[PDB]
Amino acid sequence: CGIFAYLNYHVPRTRREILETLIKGLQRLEYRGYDSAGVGFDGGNDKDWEANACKIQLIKKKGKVKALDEEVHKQQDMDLDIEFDVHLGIAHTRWATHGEPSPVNSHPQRSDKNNEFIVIHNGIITNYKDLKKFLESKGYDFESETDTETIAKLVKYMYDNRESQDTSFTTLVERVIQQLEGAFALVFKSVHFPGQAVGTRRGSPLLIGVRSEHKLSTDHIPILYRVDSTTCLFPVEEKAVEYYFASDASAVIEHTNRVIFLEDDDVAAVVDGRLSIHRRAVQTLQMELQQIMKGNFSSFMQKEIFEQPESVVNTMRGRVNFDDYTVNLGGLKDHIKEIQRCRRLILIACGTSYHAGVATRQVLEELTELPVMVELASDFLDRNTPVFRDDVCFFLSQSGETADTLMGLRYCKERGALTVGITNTVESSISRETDCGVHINAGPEIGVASTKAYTSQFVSLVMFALMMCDDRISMQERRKEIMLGLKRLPDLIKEVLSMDDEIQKLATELYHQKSVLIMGRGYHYATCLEGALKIKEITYMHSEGILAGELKHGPLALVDKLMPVIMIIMRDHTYAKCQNALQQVVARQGRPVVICDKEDTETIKNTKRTIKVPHSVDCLQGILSVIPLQLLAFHLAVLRGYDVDFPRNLAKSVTVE
Amino acid sequence: CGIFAYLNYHVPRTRREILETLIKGLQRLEYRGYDSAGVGFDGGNDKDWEANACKIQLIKKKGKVKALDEEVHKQQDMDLDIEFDVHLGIAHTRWATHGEPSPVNSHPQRSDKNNEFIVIHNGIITNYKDLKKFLESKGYDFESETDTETIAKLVKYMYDNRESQDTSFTTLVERVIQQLEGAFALVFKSVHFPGQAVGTRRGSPLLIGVRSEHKLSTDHIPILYRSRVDSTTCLFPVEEKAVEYYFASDASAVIEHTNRVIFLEDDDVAAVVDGRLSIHRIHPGRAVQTLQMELQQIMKGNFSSFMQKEIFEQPESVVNTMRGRVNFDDYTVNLGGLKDHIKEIQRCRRLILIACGTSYHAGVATRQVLEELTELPVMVELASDFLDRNTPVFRDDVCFFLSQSGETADTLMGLRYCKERGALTVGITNTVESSISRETDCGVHINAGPEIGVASTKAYTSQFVSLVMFALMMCDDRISMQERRKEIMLGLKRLPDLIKEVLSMDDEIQKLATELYHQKSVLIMGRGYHYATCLEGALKIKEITYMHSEGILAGELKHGPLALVDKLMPVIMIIMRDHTYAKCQNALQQVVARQGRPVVICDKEDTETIKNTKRTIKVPHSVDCLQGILSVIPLQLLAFHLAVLRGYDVDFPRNLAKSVTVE
Ligand SMILES: O=C[C@H](O)[C@@H](O)[C@H](O)[C@H](O)COP(=O)(O)O
Ligand SMILES: O=C[C@H](O)[C@@H](O)[C@H](O)[C@H](O)COP(=O)(O)O
Ligand SMILES: N[C@@H](CCC(=O)O)C(=O)O
């Protein structure tokens, strides 16, 4: 899900300009949830904007942001020309994992039929049933089946039982969150507090961007405990200021790169255009606007596939020195020596990030000589896996917020393990709570299906392995071989992308099929699992990865002349065994597409359809052999008429159960 | 593929009775798969059986043993009433690897046009090319495209170039196997050594059954090296000569005649000369042991297939697995196979389970309870990948090797890899004297009885129970775990009756098979204790039904696979009453919200799930770490009934192996 709110303080904006900013903020967050959306703003058609802050209008609609954009427009009652010197608008795109994605269930949620209080919520309230029963007894009636509604009905209850006539907006939200359980990121708007916004979080990201032509009072907001001009953030000599609440930085970068990352239990509040935090820093983001733009590509997934030559270079920038063959990961400098004294590596992740661990398990075993265990986070938790003080636990997470991965992190910390975060989001929970970590530095990934995050994770884990063995005389040549591979890897990726058209032809031969089996072993077990997940996710074909050595133990019975098969046969030590699997498939009359080496003339001669990828070091080849499957999934999805960026039934980053 | 030979020594039999015995032997071996078969026996219709040993008749045929039995009872020249006081007959079923299925390529293979030597062979001679060229350069002409023929020709070369007039049959075979490379089980017969048999093996099972009404000379055969062959050296009936020997590659062909067997080992050369059995190599000996196997265990009975029998007899196989090991009187567990090792095992620091296919799934199904009760790290490895990666193994690892057959190559090579690293090795097997049970430090025979069906059914659930039993041993000194152990053992006590309860819903499973009859895919979703159930049920439905079933960890749905859900994709979800119940319900809501309409395997008493879902398979509640046995059985049956609806033969293996070398 995604949160966005726009607060213009003495920066006159028309209602049209305001609603455009909200929609434009949701579009930036749409990849976080696109089942439904809604906006909340001040209604009324009084030329004087001050007589309109007592009327809150809600426009919510099932579907993607484009459906809400059309609903906001061609509205007969709303006059879009009214100028607002001060105004607060809140918006929200929803990933509806439960129930119907109906307007009633979209946010903002309201406290009554006159919208005295509205709220937008990311997360889950683990005790909304108790609150609902309590609030129902006190006379409040509910209209939706969302846990968020109990938050709106509760901030009104706290207001209906306030001791003084001027209890601050912060005081009410404080009494609310004290009764809530679980995780939440909230933005409140009320008619009783016109133009005032309150943002708070507990286990869900929430940041505040600020723009103003004038100097700002400070760059380090002080926290308060239960509000003068040396305490709040505001413009000095004038009032003009613009604030931006958001659950993701992609919605704010276009307006400003000055954001305040809230923390758990921080209750931010904008009163009289002044931002104070109750109960710290003011940072400069390094993201650029072009990083979250399609550019000349028709989709984000295709851009992020084709930019992998550059993102791989960015992952290694400042860390790999090819002149002297040295590897330094700054984030591990104060911990690498103690990691070498540990006795086991555990890699914990979900989905494609788990596949990145499968893809590097072998070279990690080889270069560290430690046991390496790779776990799916959800199952890791279900089993209460044994963990010890001399374990090193890696947590692979592009977003750094995946719930199961984060819970795994806290589980391992409670048992005293050394924790390492491999993330692509600097201010994420996983990067904060780990003892040390590496930022894979791939740039923002907007496509729901991970592409560059996978290859950048792959590379990051290889660089770690290279550090772990840098004191072994016997492994110096192996390190050189690998680092030369990394130097040549970007150009070889380019060589693979130049086969786009050849892979598109193959896609036209498969797009009508129901299933496809993808087979590999060794270094390319991960390749066949990840290709199968990509094809599942964006084409909806029933693709399944099968370990090639396991064919003879049952699954080969599926194969006949009608079952599509893709096989990966590379030039490594498993080549002869892969040739046996291919022979078994052909004996069953399978007509497989084979991803093989350009020089593998024997395979190329005897197979009709081959994808000929260039050769690299065996422990880097998985990067090259997975990219044809990224592209095949892309082209299969287009032929079948689906949107590669917005696959059905899900969104990007699983931050809740 | 299947070897059987029958030697009656001063036990008179007619040619008819001898041939009936050979054919019956081959019938016990058909279940392994084959494309042809043949027999070898003495020809000639001389009323005196002694004048017929110089003539060897072969009857081979591409096709089934029934066709061979028809060929045998159709020879106008063979008089079946001749009585042999001494005779050796050999029989073979072939799964072709070198040469197309045909009469000439069938076994027995012969050394010349007069059948001076004949041999039957399980395996592959990897250097048959060099041997065929050498023999052809010495004037020996080949008629088949099989590697086996080089063995028959080679033994005649050793005979033609023998130094003394009385070089033993064993000496000739010793020199043959010195030149062979690869895997083989072999039985030889020759007109030059009438009534004598020689068997030998390298990397392929071979055993000898024995029966006599007279006392046998020993129950432990000493080994000889090239040590004379006298009455203190070999096995024989003491005061009289009468004795019968049964060579076989599988005890299933011996057990209806005798349960006294000698299992051979690599490079043993076993010979029957003058009715006496000796074993040569190039003090140690080979035991005559009693098999706890009965013919009824390898017969269908009143079931229409072995798959149905072995599924429906799981109440009895689970009981058999626990016999002598779980005391339900004082609630203790004792695995005798681990007596001299359990204390060393308890000092190790990690458990590794290594296996293939469904045996790997049994590791996945018991991983959590092993972690809980041992408190050690438990790693579950697919054997082939384990080998590809050169996985780190250490002297204080305990490595488990799960294998119904005890011969699976990758599992067996994983075993040898771990032994080289000094790990303590444990075999969980269902086959007496298999390679994995022999080469591990200690082991447990799951004692499910022989598995004749193509797919693992009872072997899986018996492996499950054996691993739970081991877990219970590992924590028997822990005060804090005594209530948990008692709960589990009470669950084991009730498990047979709860399996019967699941089986009594067979009609409900058939209705589900009707619904999925026309479907091409089905996703099977679960987590925790029932992750393995998803993987294992999906494998059975692939292997037996030939439809695209896939197991999917429920916690992974929102990470991609949920995109497959719509109103057309069939889904089976497992929702049991354990600690992941709420998370499983969450998965169900996620699927239903995207128009999925899953069938749910759930607890018998789970009222909420049953009312809010159309079709539910309701199984009885058990302890959480045993529920996987009950939740997988409906999927075994679903695989079975779907295959029957679609007209498939559940006892016919499909993939089997790969193509045949034509060269
Ligand atoms: O195409 C697949 C997705 O990329 C998905 O499987 C993702 O890998 C997981 O949801 C983990 O998310 P994080 O990488 O943010 O932890
Ligand atoms: O039903 C499937 C088969 O049983 C297959 O998965 C595999 O070949 C065995 O499970 C492993 O063989 P062993 O258990 O004999 O090692
Ligand atoms: N390789 C031999 C024997 C195969 C088997 O074990 O049946 C052949 O093809 O004749």
Residue numbers in the entry:
A (entry chain B): 2 to 227, 241 to 293, 304 to 681
B (entry chain A): 2 to 227, 239 to 294, 301 to 681
Publication passage describing the model:
Having solved the structure of GFAT-1, we aimed to understand the mechanism of GFAT-1 activation through a single amino acid substitution (G451E) that elevated HP flux and extended lifespan in C. elegans. Positioned in an evolutionary conserved region of the isomerase domain, Gly451 is in close proximity to the UDP-GlcNAc-binding site, suggesting that the mutation might interfere with UDP-GlcNAc inhibition. Crystal structure analysis of GFAT-1 G451E revealed no major structural changes compared to wild type GFAT-1. Notably, Glu451 forms a new hydrogen bond to Gln307 of the interdomain linker in the mutant structure. Analysis of the kinetic properties of the G451E mutant revealed a comparable Km for l-Gln-hydrolysis but had a reduced kcat compared to the wild type enzyme. Very remarkably, however, GFAT-1 G451E showed a drastically reduced sensitivity to UDP-GlcNAc feedback inhibition. We conclude that GFAT-1 gain-of-function in the G451E variant results from a loss of regulation by UDP-GlcNAc-mediated feedback inhibition. In our mutants, we observed altered sensitivities to UDP-GlcNAc, which we interpret as follows: in the gain-of-function mutant G451E, which showed a reduced sensitivity to UDP-GlcNAc inhibition, the hydrogen bond between Glu451 and Gln307 stabilizes the linker and both residues might function as spacers between the interdomain linker and the UDP-GlcNAc-bound isomerase domain, preventing a close interaction.
